Amino acid sequence: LQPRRVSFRGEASEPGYDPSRPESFFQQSFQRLSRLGHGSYGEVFKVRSKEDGRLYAVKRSMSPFRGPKDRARKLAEVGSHEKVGQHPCCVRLEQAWEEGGILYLQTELCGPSLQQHCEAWGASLPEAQVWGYLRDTLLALAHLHSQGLVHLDVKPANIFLGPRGRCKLGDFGLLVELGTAGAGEVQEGDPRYMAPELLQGSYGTAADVFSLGLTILEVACNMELPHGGEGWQQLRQGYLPPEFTAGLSSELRSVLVMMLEPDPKLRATAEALLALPVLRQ
């Protein structure tokens, strides 16, 4: 068994590793410092590299490829991540590879997720912090949207905090590229964060703007989003719930109304919000 590089630039398979030894390439070229997370996808470890001594994160699938479709779905994440490319507010992928039917993604190391930060804070985030995260996530989304890419999974768990109040959008596994001249396939998203038009099958960049709006609403007001039912509909009528949003400033409330616009024809784009006075810093 040997590891093979995974990339969608056409490269077939673009030191310190001995194929003869039984230990896998992941074990030979890294030291596992800690386990950042785990779930149905597999595991994420913090690691240090031996080629350049920098710190990285590695995500690995749980169990070997069931079939060609299972392999193709998992590898597509590498392809979607490459379409994003290098941008300051997007998690950067170093390299990805497969060995033993296991997929590995190596990225830069980032801090805790917005979700973890909010759980530890145990309350609504201070508004000043919220503006920074909103601005950086809008910049990430403006980058994706300018290339015809929709993230489809914007939420606190997929936003990663950095030093000095900055953050990065990550997890491009559900990313799709818009194209009536090309092709595409869509996976199931988190219903709590779903834009209303997705129910009727209309996909576009505006869905991400709605998801970010629900994301900011959740962390700025410490509010649990509903999966369905009347509460789910109440958030998609264009009216904010008065009880939770009371403490919010006029500027943030007004930005939230624009992002939560039910009609995707009328919803603000990321480029447009970033040109508003508060966000144009």
Give the binding range for ligand QGI (CB under 6 A) out of 128-136, 167-175, 250-258, 264-272: 167-175
Nearer to ligand QGI, 59 or 143 (CB): 59
Question: Does residue 118 belong to the site contacting ligand QGI (CB under 6 A)?
Answer: no
Residue set of the binding site for ATP = 36-44, 59
Question: 3, 6, 26, 36: which one contacts ligand QGI (CB under 6 A)?
Answer: 36
By CB under 6 A, is residue 37 in contact with ligand QGI?
Answer: yes
Is 18 assigned a catalytic role?
no
Q: Does 172 sit near ligand QGI (CB under 6 A)?
A: yes
Active-site residue, selected from the candidate residues 136, 153, 190, 263: 153
User: How near is the Cβ of 160 to ligand QGI at its closest, in Å?
Assistant: 6
Residues 146 to 165: which contact ligand QGI by CB under 6 A?
A: 160
Q: Does 57 bind ligand QGI (CB under 6 A)?
A: yes
Helix axes 250-259, 127-146, angle to 10 degrees: 30
Contact positions vs ligand QGI (CB under 6 A): 36-37, 44, 57, 59, 91, 105, 107, 109-110, 160, 170-172
